[PDB]
Amino acid sequence: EMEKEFEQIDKSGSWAAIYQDIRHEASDFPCRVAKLPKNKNRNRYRDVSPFDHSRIKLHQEDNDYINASLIKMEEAQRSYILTQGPLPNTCGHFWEMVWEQKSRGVVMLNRVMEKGSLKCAQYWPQKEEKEMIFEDTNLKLTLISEDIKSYYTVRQLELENLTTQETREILHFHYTTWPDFGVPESPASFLNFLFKVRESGSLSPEHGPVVVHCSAGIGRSGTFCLADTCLLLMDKRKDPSSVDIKKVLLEMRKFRMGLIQTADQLRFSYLAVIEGAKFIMG
Length: 282
Known about the structure:
This protein is of the alpha/beta class. The protein has helices at residues 3-12, 15-25, 32-35, 91-100, 188-199, 220-236, 245-252, 263-280, and strands at residues 68-73, 78-84, 105-108, 113-114, 117-118, 132-134, 139-148, 152-161, 166-175, 210-214.
């Protein structure tokens, strides 16, 4: 299948070559809305924008914009909403999306601070008694419980639509051990983090798309989605060795640019899948 193709690439030391080929083959679509001067303060990086054809819209007539894209994998029957790390001024928007899209859980692969710099806003309450209120989108978020573990931390939050008083339970899944530089030495933690997300049913069809992000919401987030889909495909297909991860990444890139920002990440994605398939098959 790919495991061998993995070593083949390894010995030849062609990881940067393959990854570049992917950047070349990646789809190209208009991001007119994202580019609008009106929404400049709604984007983190100027080089990371959502395609207009697959962007997520906010249910509000004034402005429906948010740097988030819906990645829908037809064959895998799986959908992920990839979005940028929330900004000081886009936390209300981020939760309004989680509400309107009926998401069961939020997936975070970075820490609020990395490399001594800010990667995204502190968009969720850290204390039960001190909840957060997103005035602009009229939503209240409350920390219900927290389960801090070695490599990941799962939070049980309560999102309430102050407009209707209706409340919903959100599962915040936070992988907190991704290294400062490079990628994980072992996919073990990441793979286990992924299965936990699966176990909550946050990825299941009965709920709205799961929201995934990171500073830019394309690099590490990409690894998450790509890995899940590929493993999922190896279980469904009659021939598991047919799953071409590169082919899968390209399909995902028709939906959002950049998914998998480096060669090492691409390498890691293979590793994760290979090791993930091993754990599942048999």
